[PDB]
Coordinates of C-alpha atoms and ligand atoms in Angstrom, one line a residue:
Chain A
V3 CA 15.9 10.2 81.2
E4 CA 14.6 12.0 78.1
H5 CA 10.4 11.1 78.5
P6 CA 8.4 13.9 77.1
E7 CA 6.2 14.1 79.8
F8 CA 9.0 13.7 82.2
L9 CA 10.6 17.1 80.7
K10 CA 6.8 19.0 81.7
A11 CA 7.0 17.3 85.5
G12 CA 7.0 19.6 88.1
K13 CA 7.8 22.9 86.4
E14 CA 5.1 24.9 87.7
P15 CA 2.3 24.4 91.3
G16 CA -0.3 22.3 90.1
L17 CA -1.0 18.6 90.0
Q18 CA -0.2 16.1 87.5
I19 CA -1.8 13.0 86.5
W20 CA -0.1 10.3 84.0
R21 CA -2.0 7.0 83.4
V22 CA 0.5 3.7 82.7
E23 CA -0.6 2.6 79.3
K24 CA 1.4 -0.8 78.0
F25 CA 4.4 -0.2 79.9
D26 CA 4.7 4.1 79.4
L27 CA 4.0 6.7 81.0
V28 CA 0.9 8.9 79.2
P29 CA -1.0 12.2 80.2
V30 CA -4.5 12.5 81.6
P31 CA -6.5 15.1 79.8
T32 CA -7.3 17.3 82.4
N33 CA -11.1 17.3 81.9
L34 CA -10.9 13.6 82.9
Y35 CA -8.7 14.1 86.3
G36 CA -10.3 12.4 89.3
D37 CA -12.0 9.6 87.0
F38 CA -10.1 6.5 88.2
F39 CA -10.6 3.0 86.0
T40 CA -10.0 0.7 88.5
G41 CA -8.3 -1.5 86.1
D42 CA -5.4 0.9 85.6
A43 CA -2.4 2.2 87.2
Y44 CA -1.7 6.1 87.7
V45 CA 1.5 8.3 88.7
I46 CA -0.1 12.3 90.1
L47 CA 2.7 14.8 90.9
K48 CA 1.3 17.5 93.4
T49 CA 3.7 20.5 92.8
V50 CA 3.3 22.9 95.6
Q51 CA 5.0 26.2 95.5
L52 CA 7.5 27.2 98.7
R53 CA 8.2 30.3 99.8
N54 CA 11.7 30.3 99.1
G55 CA 10.8 30.0 95.4
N56 CA 11.7 26.0 94.6
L57 CA 8.4 23.7 94.7
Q58 CA 7.3 20.9 96.9
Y59 CA 6.5 17.7 95.4
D60 CA 4.3 14.9 95.9
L61 CA 4.3 11.4 93.9
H62 CA 1.2 9.1 94.4
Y63 CA 1.0 6.1 92.1
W64 CA -2.6 4.9 92.6
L65 CA -3.8 1.2 91.7
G66 CA -6.8 0.2 90.6
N67 CA -8.1 -3.1 92.3
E68 CA -8.0 -4.8 88.8
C69 CA -4.8 -3.1 87.3
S70 CA -2.3 -5.9 86.1
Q71 CA 1.5 -7.0 87.0
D72 CA 2.7 -4.9 84.9
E73 CA 0.6 -2.1 85.1
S74 CA 1.3 -1.6 89.1
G75 CA 4.9 -2.3 88.8
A76 CA 5.4 0.0 86.2
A77 CA 3.4 3.3 88.0
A78 CA 6.1 1.7 91.1
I79 CA 9.3 2.0 89.1
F80 CA 7.9 5.6 86.8
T81 CA 7.6 7.1 90.5
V82 CA 10.8 6.4 91.3
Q83 CA 12.3 7.6 87.8
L84 CA 10.8 10.8 88.3
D85 CA 11.6 11.4 91.8
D86 CA 15.0 10.8 90.7
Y87 CA 14.2 13.2 87.6
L88 CA 13.6 15.5 90.4
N89 CA 16.9 15.3 92.4
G90 CA 14.9 12.8 94.7
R91 CA 12.9 16.2 95.9
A92 CA 9.5 13.8 96.2
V93 CA 8.0 12.1 99.0
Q94 CA 6.0 8.7 97.7
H95 CA 3.2 7.6 98.4
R96 CA 1.5 4.3 97.2
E97 CA -2.2 5.1 96.9
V98 CA -4.1 1.4 96.8
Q99 CA -7.8 1.8 95.4
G100 CA -10.3 2.4 98.6
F101 CA -7.2 3.1 100.9
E102 CA -6.1 6.4 99.8
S103 CA -4.9 8.7 101.9
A104 CA -6.4 11.9 103.0
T105 CA -4.0 14.2 101.7
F106 CA -4.8 12.9 98.1
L107 CA -8.3 12.3 98.3
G108 CA -8.1 16.0 99.2
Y109 CA -6.5 16.8 95.9
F110 CA -10.0 16.2 94.1
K111 CA -12.0 19.1 95.2
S112 CA -15.3 17.4 93.8
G113 CA -14.3 13.9 95.2
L114 CA -12.5 11.6 93.1
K115 CA -14.6 8.7 91.5
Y116 CA -13.9 5.0 90.7
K117 CA -15.1 3.5 87.5
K118 CA -15.1 0.0 86.0
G119 CA -12.5 -0.9 82.6
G120 CA -9.3 0.5 81.6
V121 CA -6.2 -0.5 79.6
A122 CA -5.3 -4.0 79.1
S123 CA -2.1 -5.1 80.0
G124 CA 1.2 -4.7 78.3
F125 CA 2.2 -8.5 78.4
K126 CA 3.2 -11.3 76.9
Chain B
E4 CA 10.9 -3.0 68.2
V5 CA 14.1 -4.4 69.1
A6 CA 13.5 -7.0 71.9
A7 CA 15.4 -6.9 75.6
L8 CA 16.2 -10.3 77.1
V9 CA 16.1 -10.9 81.1
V10 CA 18.0 -13.5 82.8
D11 CA 17.7 -14.5 86.4
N12 CA 20.9 -16.0 87.4
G13 CA 19.9 -18.4 91.0
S14 CA 21.9 -20.7 92.5
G15 CA 19.6 -23.5 91.8
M16 CA 17.7 -22.3 89.1
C17 CA 18.5 -19.9 86.3
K18 CA 15.1 -18.4 84.8
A19 CA 15.6 -16.3 81.3
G20 CA 13.2 -15.2 78.7
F21 CA 11.7 -11.9 76.8
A22 CA 11.3 -8.8 78.8
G23 CA 7.3 -7.8 78.3
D24 CA 6.5 -11.3 78.4
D25 CA 5.1 -12.0 81.9
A26 CA 6.9 -15.2 83.0
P27 CA 9.9 -16.8 82.0
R28 CA 10.3 -19.2 79.2
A29 CA 13.4 -21.2 80.7
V30 CA 13.4 -22.1 83.7
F31 CA 16.6 -24.3 84.3
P32 CA 19.3 -25.9 86.6
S33 CA 22.7 -23.8 86.9
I34 CA 24.8 -26.8 86.3
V35 CA 27.4 -27.5 84.1
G36 CA 28.5 -31.1 83.0
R37 CA 31.7 -32.3 82.0
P38 CA 32.7 -35.4 81.0
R39 CA 33.3 -37.4 84.4
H40 CA 36.5 -39.3 83.0
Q41 CA 38.8 -38.4 80.0
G42 CA 38.2 -41.3 77.5
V43 CA 36.3 -41.6 74.3
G48 CA 29.3 -38.0 75.5
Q49 CA 29.1 -36.2 73.0
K50 CA 30.0 -32.6 72.9
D51 CA 32.6 -31.2 75.3
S52 CA 30.2 -30.2 78.3
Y53 CA 26.4 -29.9 79.0
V54 CA 24.2 -27.2 81.0
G55 CA 20.8 -27.4 82.8
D56 CA 18.4 -30.4 82.4
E57 CA 20.2 -32.2 79.5
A58 CA 23.2 -31.8 82.1
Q59 CA 21.1 -33.4 84.6
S60 CA 20.2 -35.9 82.7
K61 CA 23.6 -36.9 81.6
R62 CA 25.3 -37.2 85.0
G63 CA 25.9 -40.9 84.9
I64 CA 28.8 -39.8 82.7
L65 CA 29.4 -36.1 83.5
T66 CA 30.6 -34.7 86.4
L67 CA 28.0 -31.7 87.3
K68 CA 29.6 -28.0 88.5
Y69 CA 27.5 -25.4 90.2
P70 CA 29.0 -22.3 88.9
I71 CA 26.6 -19.6 91.1
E72 CA 27.2 -20.2 95.1
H73 CA 24.7 -18.5 97.5
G74 CA 24.1 -16.0 94.1
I75 CA 27.4 -15.4 93.8
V76 CA 28.9 -16.4 91.0
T77 CA 32.3 -18.4 91.8
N78 CA 33.3 -19.9 88.4
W79 CA 33.4 -17.6 85.0
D80 CA 34.0 -20.2 82.7
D81 CA 31.1 -22.3 83.8
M82 CA 28.8 -19.1 84.5
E83 CA 29.8 -18.5 80.3
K84 CA 28.8 -21.8 79.5
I85 CA 25.6 -21.3 80.9
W86 CA 24.9 -18.0 79.9
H87 CA 25.9 -19.1 76.1
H88 CA 24.0 -22.2 76.1
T89 CA 20.6 -19.5 77.6
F90 CA 21.4 -17.5 74.5
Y91 CA 21.6 -19.8 71.9
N92 CA 20.0 -23.2 73.5
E93 CA 17.2 -22.2 75.2
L94 CA 16.0 -18.8 74.2
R95 CA 17.2 -19.3 70.4
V96 CA 18.8 -15.7 69.8
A97 CA 22.1 -14.2 68.4
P98 CA 23.0 -12.2 71.6
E99 CA 24.5 -9.6 69.9
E100 CA 21.1 -8.2 68.5
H101 CA 19.8 -7.7 72.2
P102 CA 20.0 -5.5 75.1
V103 CA 20.6 -8.2 78.2
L104 CA 19.1 -7.4 81.9
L105 CA 21.0 -9.3 84.3
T106 CA 20.2 -9.7 87.8
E107 CA 22.9 -10.2 91.1
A108 CA 22.6 -10.4 94.2
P109 CA 22.4 -8.1 97.4
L110 CA 25.9 -6.9 98.5
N111 CA 27.4 -8.6 95.2
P112 CA 31.3 -8.0 94.8
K113 CA 32.4 -5.4 92.8
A114 CA 35.0 -6.8 90.7
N115 CA 31.8 -9.9 90.3
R116 CA 29.9 -6.6 89.3
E117 CA 32.7 -5.6 86.3
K118 CA 33.3 -9.4 85.2
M119 CA 29.6 -9.9 84.1
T120 CA 29.7 -6.7 82.2
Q121 CA 32.9 -7.2 80.7
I122 CA 32.3 -10.6 79.5
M123 CA 28.5 -9.6 78.2
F124 CA 30.5 -7.1 76.1
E125 CA 33.5 -8.7 75.0
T126 CA 32.3 -12.6 74.6
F127 CA 28.7 -12.0 73.4
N128 CA 29.2 -8.8 72.2
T129 CA 25.5 -7.6 73.4
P130 CA 24.9 -3.8 72.4
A131 CA 23.3 -3.0 75.6
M132 CA 23.4 -4.5 79.3
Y133 CA 21.9 -3.5 82.6
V134 CA 22.7 -5.7 85.8
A135 CA 19.4 -4.7 88.9
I136 CA 19.4 -6.4 92.6
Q137 CA 17.0 -9.4 92.7
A138 CA 15.5 -7.8 95.9
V139 CA 14.2 -4.5 94.0
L140 CA 12.9 -6.3 90.9
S141 CA 11.0 -8.6 93.5
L142 CA 9.2 -5.5 95.1
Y143 CA 8.8 -3.6 92.1
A144 CA 7.1 -6.7 90.7
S145 CA 4.7 -6.0 93.9
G146 CA 3.5 -3.0 93.1
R147 CA 6.2 -1.2 95.8
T148 CA 9.2 1.3 96.3
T149 CA 9.2 0.8 99.8
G150 CA 9.9 -2.5 101.8
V151 CA 11.6 -5.0 103.1
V152 CA 12.3 -8.0 100.7
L153 CA 12.4 -11.5 102.1
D154 CA 14.3 -13.5 99.6
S155 CA 14.9 -17.3 100.0
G156 CA 15.9 -19.5 97.1
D157 CA 18.8 -22.2 97.0
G158 CA 21.9 -20.3 97.9
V159 CA 21.5 -18.2 100.9
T160 CA 18.1 -15.9 102.1
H161 CA 18.5 -12.2 102.5
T162 CA 16.0 -10.1 104.1
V163 CA 16.6 -6.5 102.4
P164 CA 15.4 -3.3 102.9
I165 CA 13.9 -0.5 100.3
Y166 CA 13.1 2.6 100.4
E167 CA 11.7 5.1 97.8
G168 CA 12.9 2.5 94.8
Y169 CA 16.7 1.7 96.7
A170 CA 17.5 -0.7 99.1
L171 CA 19.7 0.4 102.0
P172 CA 22.9 -1.4 101.9
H173 CA 23.9 -1.2 105.1
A174 CA 20.2 -2.9 106.8
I175 CA 21.0 -5.6 104.5
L176 CA 20.7 -9.0 106.7
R177 CA 21.8 -12.7 106.3
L178 CA 20.5 -16.4 107.2
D179 CA 22.9 -19.0 105.7
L180 CA 20.4 -21.4 104.9
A181 CA 18.3 -22.1 101.6
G182 CA 16.6 -24.8 99.7
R183 CA 18.8 -27.0 99.4
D184 CA 19.1 -27.3 102.8
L185 CA 15.7 -27.9 103.8
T186 CA 16.1 -30.2 100.8
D187 CA 18.9 -31.9 103.0
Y188 CA 17.3 -32.0 106.3
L189 CA 13.8 -33.1 105.3
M190 CA 16.1 -36.5 103.4
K191 CA 17.6 -36.9 107.1
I192 CA 14.4 -36.8 109.1
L193 CA 13.0 -39.1 106.3
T194 CA 15.5 -41.7 107.1
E195 CA 14.5 -41.1 111.0
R196 CA 11.1 -43.1 109.9
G197 CA 13.3 -45.6 108.5
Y198 CA 13.6 -44.4 104.8
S199 CA 16.7 -43.6 102.6
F200 CA 17.1 -41.4 100.2
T201 CA 20.9 -41.0 99.0
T202 CA 20.8 -40.6 95.2
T203 CA 20.1 -38.2 93.0
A204 CA 17.0 -39.7 92.1
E205 CA 16.3 -40.3 95.4
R206 CA 16.7 -36.7 96.3
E207 CA 14.6 -35.8 93.9
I208 CA 11.9 -37.4 94.8
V209 CA 12.8 -35.9 98.6
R210 CA 12.5 -32.2 96.9
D211 CA 9.3 -33.2 95.2
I212 CA 7.8 -34.3 99.0
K213 CA 9.4 -31.0 100.2
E214 CA 7.6 -28.6 97.5
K215 CA 4.1 -30.8 97.7
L216 CA 3.8 -31.8 101.3
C217 CA 5.4 -29.2 103.2
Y218 CA 4.1 -26.3 105.2
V219 CA 4.8 -24.1 108.0
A220 CA 2.9 -24.8 111.2
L221 CA 1.5 -21.3 112.9
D222 CA 1.9 -22.9 116.3
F223 CA 5.2 -25.5 116.1
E224 CA 5.4 -27.0 119.4
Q225 CA 1.0 -27.7 119.1
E226 CA 1.6 -28.9 115.8
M227 CA 4.5 -31.2 117.5
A228 CA 1.8 -32.4 119.8
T229 CA -0.9 -33.0 117.9
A230 CA 1.3 -35.4 115.5
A231 CA 2.5 -37.3 118.5
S232 CA -1.8 -37.8 119.4
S233 CA -3.0 -38.4 115.9
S234 CA -2.4 -39.5 112.4
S235 CA -4.5 -36.8 111.2
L236 CA -1.6 -34.5 110.3
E237 CA 0.1 -37.6 108.4
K238 CA 0.1 -37.6 104.3
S239 CA 0.9 -40.9 102.2
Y240 CA 3.0 -40.1 99.3
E241 CA 3.4 -42.4 96.4
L242 CA 7.0 -42.7 94.9
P243 CA 7.9 -43.4 91.2
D244 CA 7.4 -47.4 91.9
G245 CA 4.5 -47.3 93.6
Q246 CA 6.1 -47.8 97.0
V247 CA 3.8 -45.7 99.3
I248 CA 5.3 -43.9 102.2
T249 CA 3.9 -41.6 105.2
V250 CA 5.6 -38.1 105.5
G251 CA 4.1 -37.0 109.5
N252 CA 5.5 -34.0 111.2
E253 CA 8.1 -33.9 109.0
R254 CA 6.1 -31.4 106.4
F255 CA 6.2 -29.4 109.0
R256 CA 9.5 -29.8 111.1
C257 CA 11.2 -29.3 107.4
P258 CA 10.2 -25.7 106.8
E259 CA 10.2 -25.1 111.1
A260 CA 14.1 -25.3 110.2
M261 CA 13.8 -21.6 108.9
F262 CA 12.7 -20.0 111.9
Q263 CA 14.6 -22.0 114.2
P264 CA 17.7 -22.4 112.2
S265 CA 19.3 -24.7 115.7
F266 CA 17.1 -27.6 114.1
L267 CA 20.4 -27.4 111.4
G268 CA 22.7 -26.7 114.0
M269 CA 22.6 -23.2 113.4
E270 CA 23.0 -20.6 116.2
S271 CA 21.5 -18.0 113.7
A272 CA 18.2 -16.4 114.2
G273 CA 15.3 -17.0 111.9
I274 CA 13.9 -15.9 109.6
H275 CA 11.3 -13.9 111.4
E276 CA 14.0 -12.2 113.8
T277 CA 16.5 -11.5 110.5
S278 CA 13.2 -9.6 109.2
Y279 CA 12.7 -7.9 112.2
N280 CA 16.8 -7.2 112.5
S281 CA 16.7 -5.5 109.0
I282 CA 14.0 -3.4 109.6
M283 CA 15.3 -2.0 113.2
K284 CA 19.0 -1.0 111.0
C285 CA 16.8 1.4 109.3
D286 CA 16.1 4.9 109.9
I287 CA 13.0 5.2 113.0
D288 CA 11.0 7.1 110.0
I289 CA 10.6 4.4 107.8
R290 CA 9.9 1.5 109.8
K291 CA 6.4 1.9 110.0
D292 CA 6.3 1.8 105.9
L293 CA 8.6 -1.4 106.4
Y294 CA 6.7 -3.4 108.4
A295 CA 3.7 -2.7 106.6
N296 CA 5.4 -4.1 103.5
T297 CA 7.1 -7.3 104.0
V298 CA 7.5 -9.2 100.8
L299 CA 8.3 -12.7 100.5
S300 CA 10.3 -13.8 97.4
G301 CA 12.2 -16.9 96.2
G302 CA 11.2 -20.7 95.7
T303 CA 11.5 -21.0 99.4
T304 CA 8.7 -18.6 100.7
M305 CA 6.2 -21.2 98.6
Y306 CA 5.9 -22.9 102.0
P307 CA 1.9 -22.7 102.7
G308 CA 1.2 -21.2 106.0
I309 CA 4.6 -19.0 105.7
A310 CA 2.6 -15.2 105.7
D311 CA 0.7 -16.6 108.7
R312 CA 3.8 -17.4 110.7
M313 CA 5.8 -14.4 109.5
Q314 CA 2.6 -12.2 110.7
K315 CA 2.1 -13.9 113.8
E316 CA 6.1 -14.2 114.8
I317 CA 7.2 -10.3 113.6
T318 CA 4.0 -9.0 115.2
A319 CA 5.2 -10.8 118.6
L320 CA 8.5 -9.2 117.9
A321 CA 7.2 -5.5 116.7
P322 CA 5.4 -2.4 119.1
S323 CA 1.4 -3.8 118.9
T324 CA 1.3 -0.3 117.6
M325 CA 2.7 -1.5 114.3
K326 CA 0.7 -2.5 111.3
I327 CA 2.7 -5.8 109.9
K328 CA 1.5 -7.0 106.2
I329 CA 3.4 -9.7 104.5
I330 CA 2.8 -9.9 101.2
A331 CA 3.3 -13.6 99.6
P332 CA 2.3 -13.4 95.9
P333 CA 1.7 -16.7 94.1
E334 CA 4.1 -16.0 91.7
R335 CA 6.9 -15.7 94.1
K336 CA 8.8 -17.9 92.8
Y337 CA 9.4 -15.8 89.6
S338 CA 8.9 -12.3 91.2
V339 CA 12.6 -11.3 90.1
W340 CA 12.1 -12.4 86.9
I341 CA 8.7 -10.7 86.2
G342 CA 9.8 -7.6 87.6
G343 CA 13.0 -7.4 85.6
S344 CA 10.7 -8.2 82.7
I345 CA 8.6 -5.2 83.4
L346 CA 11.5 -2.6 84.2
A347 CA 13.5 -3.6 80.8
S348 CA 9.8 -3.1 78.5
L349 CA 9.1 1.0 80.2
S350 CA 10.0 3.5 77.6
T351 CA 12.3 5.5 80.4
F352 CA 14.9 2.5 80.0
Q353 CA 15.9 3.1 76.9
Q354 CA 18.6 5.3 78.5
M355 CA 19.2 3.2 82.1
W356 CA 21.2 0.8 79.6
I357 CA 24.6 0.8 79.8
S358 CA 25.5 0.7 76.0
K359 CA 28.8 -0.6 73.7
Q360 CA 29.6 3.0 73.4
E361 CA 29.7 3.3 77.2
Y362 CA 31.2 -0.1 77.7
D363 CA 34.0 1.1 75.3
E364 CA 34.7 4.3 76.7
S365 CA 35.3 3.5 80.2
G366 CA 35.5 -0.2 80.5
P367 CA 34.0 -2.8 82.9
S368 CA 33.7 0.1 85.6
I369 CA 31.0 1.9 84.5
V370 CA 28.9 -0.6 86.2
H371 CA 28.9 1.3 89.5
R372 CA 27.5 4.6 87.7
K373 CA 25.3 2.8 85.7
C374 CA 23.9 0.6 88.1
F375 CA 23.8 1.2 91.6
Ligands
LIG401 N1 6.2 -25.1 96.3 C1 7.6 -24.9 97.2 N2 7.8 -25.2 98.0 C2 8.9 -25.0 98.8 N3 10.1 -25.1 98.4 C3 10.0 -24.9 97.1 C4 9.1 -25.0 95.9 N4 8.8 -24.9 94.7 C5 10.6 -24.2 94.5 N5 11.1 -24.5 95.8 C6 12.2 -24.4 96.0 O1 13.0 -23.7 96.0 C7 14.3 -23.2 95.8 C8 14.5 -23.0 94.3 O2 14.2 -21.5 94.7 P1 14.6 -20.1 93.7 O3 14.5 -20.2 92.3 O4 14.1 -19.2 94.1 O5 16.1 -20.1 94.3 P2 17.6 -20.0 92.9 O6 17.2 -18.4 92.1 O7 18.0 -20.2 91.9 O8 18.7 -19.5 94.2 P3 19.5 -18.0 95.0 O9 18.2 -17.3 94.9 O10 19.7 -18.3 96.1 O11 20.2 -18.0 94.2 C9 14.5 -25.1 95.8 O12 15.0 -25.1 96.9 C10 13.4 -25.7 95.5 O13 13.2 -26.6 96.3
LIG402 CA1 -5.5 -2.0 82.7
LIG403 MG1 16.9 -16.3 92.9

């Protein structure tokens, strides 16, 4: 994959969040990290530095209760593609609104928030 | 810009459409009809619905058996018809995503590729496993997909986006077998459904009145004592018949293959068996993400029954979750439509240049 966002992904320790927008992976502005639209699906990459030098990866695809089939389907596929791009070093996690893992919730020191709305489905 | 096509070649029904659409535009029988005799029924052959309607003067052939293409001459006919008559496109203008059955023979993958590039001159193409497309359509990268259509039934464990071939299993019983079984048990009431139009009535009864019992032996007793479970079905003329325990006995065959004389394990056991062939460390995930796909998984009550059956086989600790989307008859196609629509899919396609460089063997390195 030659996606600009893939080139940026997992370069250094930290948290990266993208939102699925009409079949594409769009970065979420850092100022909006933790504020999830329930009508959308997102892909979150948590890069953790390893003592050996190489980075640890955990990919989480978060699914809003009202996101459409194309959004959740795209989020799952982008997750597989990013894992593949990162030489299969990422552990993938499906995070459903209201049932997110403690690990994921923990990425947001302030506590994550849900907000109704989002972008429309990319079908038809 | 450019629009990709998505074609799911089923043993029974072909689903075709455009990537980005939420449903296929053409859904038709996977049949090629040629002149019955050799005399004077106009064209050289027919495909799909037209073939089925003109069956009086044609001999129908089914190129796809158990999800595997067994006649390439007839498959080309089906593809030609799909492009020019069903989708109304010039194939040379569109990348084409085709689906395949789990464990599709290596030689068949190459042949499918050769035909697309050499016969239809597609600028690009891709082959995806049906089960995996259904998992993606459900928004998951890990799970076990139970795909039951017209050919055979497959249980396909998938981990982080990829199927685990060693754990793929199968029950050689599917839709047609159940229609045939319903046809049979209905005769035991005193009904005769032997013609094509009659088999169609039976198939409709199967699709509209059948259901999976949570507790079969108890459903049986309920029926042997009351007319509570009985329905009535109005035939095309006006003749009315009454369907009784055949409603749940027909799909019961999926759980009890012995009903069809098979010594095979039912779908719940096959699912459990597939999960047990996988690394212990991923089994929890599989149990919680058992996804149903295909027309033959459309029976009401099937998910509740699968949950109950798999729960009895797995440790009481394991959380069992059966996912049965209402749109599962088209899950494979929808998965394909989403995949081919992604901005990141451009480099995934096998291009004309690549085919020209390596030949059909390119499919084993681009589509795995
Ligand atoms: N509501 C329904 N209830 C039960 N069976 C149904 C229902 N709708 C369709 N079917 C059955 O599903 C079958 C067709 O399914 P499907 O389209 O998934 O198969 P296919 O793609 O052609 O087969 P395969 O994947 O084996 O190649 C037929 O036997 C049909 O009668
Ligand atoms: Ca949305
Ligand atoms: Mg199918």
